[PDB]
Symmetry: C2
């Protein structure tokens, strides 16, 4: 039905309010669906952006589960699935979208939530829901490059794209060249591997792999895929095999592992990305930075380097021992078949 | 006369005693010319080596100044012109050879001294005397590679040359290949410049340049060659220009200067040379070695790093000021003409 195609419009222009009209359509949102900022002038808006629209999508006003947790993350904040706290927020939102029985209520829940929660988070939570509901199958999700170009492109282009789009009429617009080999000069031998590290393609593959094989949510909510452990081993293992190949093609040696976490990290990296959602840039790492104990009260991270070292020491022990121990105290054997997994 | 050609025989086999016979000749040395080790069995020797020679060169017994200072340096010790003490020893010996009126007494002094003083030192002292004594002009001094191959060749070959020369008859002897690119592997990017750093040619040029333009000997005219200061600047300046060129041809950046002496030296170098005169090998320098205050009582070196730093600070000051100050206290101006010199 249409509903499937109407959800895809949510991916359009993530930071433009949902009432501004996406593609050749526009949403006819209730006033209790308007944000607190814009609700007090709702009448002036629905009318103002009604123009230029072929279709008008109605949206029924429903109950809507509590969106406190989803909304806890700031709108101008970054979103990562590695941070403990974000995991709990996303997994909760995924749970809401996943828990809407009908494809019509999913559209209603989405339309409301969209302008209240972090765009990056919304995109993830929706992507995961759509991909793993039964009614929304075979649905072609727009490339995350197209919805979030800031994670894939030198920040320099953005003010050129703004200039070009404002000054020059459509049809006469020149294609914007995206800078390559732009993060470091030839003094850094690492700069040679730009075509791999910074390639759009491989970064998309990595992002998507983690979409379809998450490590947290609910085992029935898509965590427990056959041999996902072995997959995690192999896929990442092939990344380095391919990387090491490309290294040899640029007169470099094989990548040296992170022997130990106390010694400095020789290779710094300034990525040159600017998050338009956070309105800030990603920080760089300097040469010879040292790993430091984390105390990020907000993010819910209280971890010492020694904690990491302790985990490693134990994992090594298990691997040599040949077995692990479950919470219960029983032993599980790292056999030829399932060991790696 | 013959005398000129007879001195060249001293350069032959530097560590073989002078009574063993050089080329197609042999020396008829007095018994008071024999060393303390060999004098007590002089009769057995002069006879044992005398034959199979077309010539026997007589040598008249002369007075001979005290050779204490020349003999102060051990026979199995290394010799460098940079070490303060060696400078005083060599300059004194040079003075003796230089001070022998006749080309016959030079031959007599030499023949005596040769087996009592350090071979490396002898070679230098003689080389300098011949080139600047007035009788021995326009001469052909043998290449120092041929007399001291240990300073120009991987030590590995020496036991092959000994094997080949003992086992195989003359005429059937295979040429010994000299290893190239042998001091470091491809993990060290510096190894690429072997063909320049370790080339026989350029090392000979450097050695010889310092022969004809010494910086301190005795008698100022020998040091005082036209614009030798500017020469010292330019010649060495061209070495680095050429080096920096060769760097660019091996995918390397321009050579980084020694900014400051307290910071570690990143690039180590093990030269793989074995001094047959010292019977030891040259020490290597490890990666990230640090310069340290010297206290070499024997060599007469008592220098702190800060001394070096102080000299540099003062030289910079003079250069910026635009003038220097002589011992007397007067000022000399670094003009366009003689400034560099
Ligand atoms: Cu020099």
């Amino acid at each position: 039905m249409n509903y499937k195609k109407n959800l895809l419009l949510l991916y359009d222009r993530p930071r433009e309010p949902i009432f501004m009209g996406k593609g050749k359509s526009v949403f006819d949102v209730p006033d209790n669906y308007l944000t607190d900022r814009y609700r007090p002038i709702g009448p002036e808006i629905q009318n103002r952006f009604g123009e230029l629209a072929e279709e008008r999508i109605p949206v029924r006003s429903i109950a809507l589960p509590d969106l406190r947790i989803p909304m806890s993350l700031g709108r101008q904040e970054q979103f990562s699935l590695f941070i403990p706290r974000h995991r709990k927020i996303a997994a909760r939102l995924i749970d809401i979208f996943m828990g809407m029985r009908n494809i019509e209520e999913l559209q209603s829940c989405a339309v409301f939530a969209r302008d209240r929660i972090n765009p990056y988070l919304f995109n993830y939570a929706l992507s995961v829901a759509l991909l793993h509901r039964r009614d929304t199958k075979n649905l072609d999700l727009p490339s995350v490059v197209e919805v979030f170009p800031d994670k894939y492109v030198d920040s320099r282009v953005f003010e050129q794209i703004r200039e070009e789009a404002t000054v020059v009429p459509e049809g006469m617009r020149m294609p914007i060249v995206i800078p390559k080999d732009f993060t470091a000069s030839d003094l850094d031998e690492e700069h040679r591997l730009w075509y791999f590290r910074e390639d759009i393609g491989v970064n998309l593959h990595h992002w998507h792999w983690h979409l379809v094989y998450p490590f947290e949510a609910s085992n029935r909510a898509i965590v427990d895929k056959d041999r996902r452990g072995e997959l995690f081993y192999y896929m990442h293992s092939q990344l380095i095999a391919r990387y090491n190949f490309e290294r040899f093609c640029n007169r470099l040696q094989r990548v040296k592992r992170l022997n130990n976490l106390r010694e400095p990290i020789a290779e710094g990296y300034f990525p040159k990305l600017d998050s338009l959602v956070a309105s800030r840039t990603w920080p760089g790492r300097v040469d010879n930075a040292v790993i430091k104990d984390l105390n990020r009260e907000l993010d819910q991270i209280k971890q010492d380097v020694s904690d990491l070292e302790r985990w490693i020491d134990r994992i090594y022990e298990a691997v040599h021992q040949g077995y692990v121990v479950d919470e219960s105290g029983n032993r599980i054997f790292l056999d030829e078949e399932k060991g790696i997994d």
